[PDB]
Structure formats: structure tokens, C-alpha cells
Amino acid sequence: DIVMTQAAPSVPVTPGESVSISCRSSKSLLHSNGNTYLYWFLQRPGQSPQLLIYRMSNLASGVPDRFSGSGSGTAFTLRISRVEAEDVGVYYCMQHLEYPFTFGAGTKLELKRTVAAPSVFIFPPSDEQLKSGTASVVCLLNNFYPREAKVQWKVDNALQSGNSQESVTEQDSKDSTYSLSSTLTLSKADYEKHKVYACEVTHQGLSSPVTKSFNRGE
Amino acid sequence: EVKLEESGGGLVQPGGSMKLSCVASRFTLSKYWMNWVRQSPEKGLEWVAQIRLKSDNYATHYAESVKGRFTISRDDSKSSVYLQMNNLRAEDTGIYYCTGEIFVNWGQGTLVTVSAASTKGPSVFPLAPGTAALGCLVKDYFPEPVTVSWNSGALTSGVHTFPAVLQSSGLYSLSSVVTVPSSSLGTQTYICNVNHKPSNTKVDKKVEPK
């Protein structure tokens, strides 16, 4: 069917600089009409998609004039002249020349900023939780940049695998940083066997990996 | 301003039925073609169905993956469009939006969860501690979503409520954390306001150091 390809899953920009987002179709989107049947959308985090461009190069009503769209039959480009914080989200192309209407996979815009070492905290499992028969050990990585962080869990300083999960916040609108949580789930009895719980963090902002730990007793 | 509003979503059994509605305000629905578009992390944005006007004999077009199971309809006098979804599959799970003819107007979307798993309310545990970090762990719930706030919305300055992670056997977990000064500990009271509407669960949990 008409396949819409957006090669870049993500693209980084320093605020106030320009960016180009590419899209390609497996067939020409040019109608005998003389118009190219392609839409561009922005989906800001936690929001519905919003139209930016119709017929490949036309600005939709109320869209800032820093946006532009161009292309030639099968290769299309969305451009932003000067990126602002309100421009972060996922950029999608869509063709409406033929049924079914198809969308590209999306390109997310990310803001570049200076390196920020994470502020690391460790949280022991609550007493209320231990009664249930399970232990959750939480490690927070606060306001850091770039996204890449290595979180190594340690139980009696032995490396851990398979018993931990991560979740990352979207880039912060205020200062362009990320925050990350890393939870370790262990059975209460397995938790009660070992003493020292450590969270080791490697990030380019740190001169050597940072360790936040605790002893189960206290 | 034009407003589209979807309703009828929720948790449903595979093989079951569900009808979604979309109501238009400040929009002469009868003059425009309407569409349903869905979204999942797996498939991204997917165009589902379209309905034309009365003078187009209400012509419909559907995505192939939905053909024979979904039916799009309109009732111009009720200012509404509908999506009747039969013999629902796990792949049909996601946020369903209705839109107008030129994709300018979209509703906020309605979440459709197709699963054989039963509803389950969460457990709220505290994450007790220059700058200090305080939190609340909202563990073991189904389906999504959960809502977390701090001091009934009075303290929003340094809050970080994390995206929900799916666990080992189809149960979600979520952490909500906050940054506050060390001088404020024991002086200012910090409370996490939790709610999980599918299971009718509401928790008000205080965060105090051990």
C-alpha cells in the first residue's frame, strides 16, 4: 500500500537553530489536480495531533510562520527556521491521495543543552510493602543531560540483571533535562537475606560513576 | 472554537463489542466528512474509517485490518459520528480520535483496552528521604491510567511522575517523585494524591521520613 517512511526516529536541535524533518512515499503524491496530497502534524506530549501543513507546502491557519513544507513528488521536508520549546513533540507526515490514508512512524524533536550530571537518590522498600511479601528498591536520577545513563544495581556489591525496570520522563519544558527512575523488585525473603543495596550511575557529566547506597538495617 | 468530543472507550473482552461516539460543538457536522484515527505505541497513528455526506449516499471507506468488524455511521441531527467495533482483538487496543474532513479538528481521544484481564486497584507506598527527594510508588494496577498530584495541586515546582511500566504478568507500576529543600523536612507536610478510576480507587498518602 502507500508506505510513508520517516527515516529519523528522533532529531536534536539547539534552541533558536533550524531543523529539517524528512518523509518519503512509495508512490508520487501528486494529483492530476497539480496538488501534492501530504499533511504534516505535530503531536506535543500528552496532546492530540495538530495540523501544521496541508497540500505539502501550505501553512495551516494559526501555525507560526517559522514552519515551512516543501518537496518533490515522493521526498518531503518540513522545516522550522528557529526552534522554540513549544516545538518539541512528534512530527508525522500523512498521505491522503489514496485509501487507506497512511502515516509515517514519526520523528521526535529534542532540544540540545549543556551536559548536566544527574542528582542521584536511593529509596529503601517501605515497611508497609514488606508485609505484602515483596520489596521495591527505587533509584532516582534527577535533572540530567544527555538521555544516556547507565544504572547498575548492586545487592551485597554483586551485579544484578532481569529484576529491574526503567522509565524516563519526557524532556523538561523548563530546563530541557531528563529524569529517570530505576526500580528493583525482589521477594521480601530474598531482600531480608542481603544487607547493602547500591545504585551505581555512569553518565558523561560525572568524572567517575556515582554510587548511592544503604544498609538494610537502619 | 470548534470542539469534537469522543466517548464510549474503556476495558473490553477479546471477541466483544463496543460502540464509540463523537459529538461536535460549533461545527456544522452535516457539511463535512468525518474520520476515526487510532494510536498505539506499537503501530503509531492509524487511519481507521471515513464517512461522507448524505448526498454522497453516506459513502464509507475502512482500513483493511478493521474491514468487516467496524462500522462507521453518522447522525447529523444529533451532531454525531459513531464507530461500532465488533469481534474486538488485542491489536485494536489504543486511543481512538474522531476528526473532521481536513484533520484540523481532533477530539481529546477515548482509550480502548481489549484484554481478558480483570480490573485491579493499586497500592501506594512512600519514598521517604541542600536538596532532598520525596516520593510515592503506585504499584500493581490494571488497566491504565492512574492520576498523581501533590498537596491537591499546591506543590508542582519540582515534580516528576514517571510513565507507567508493564510488569511480569500484566500489571502496571508507576513512581511519582519531588525535589524540596532539607529545611522543609518535618516543617512542611508533603502528600501524594492518587486515583485509579477503572477500579474506583482514591488514595491520600502522606510522605514522612523513617
Binding site: N33, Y54, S61 | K31, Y32, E101, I102, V104
Partner: peptide
């Protein structure tokens, strides 16, 4: 207003 209607009608093709 009729601006949205004007745009829809100009863009419509069957």
C-alpha cells in the same frame, strides 16, 4: 464563520 468551510470546499476532491 465560513473560513473553515471555504477551505474544506476548496480542498475537497472526489
Amino acid at each position: 464563520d465560513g473560513d473553515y468551510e471555504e477551505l474544506v470546499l476548496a480542498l475537497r476532491s472526489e
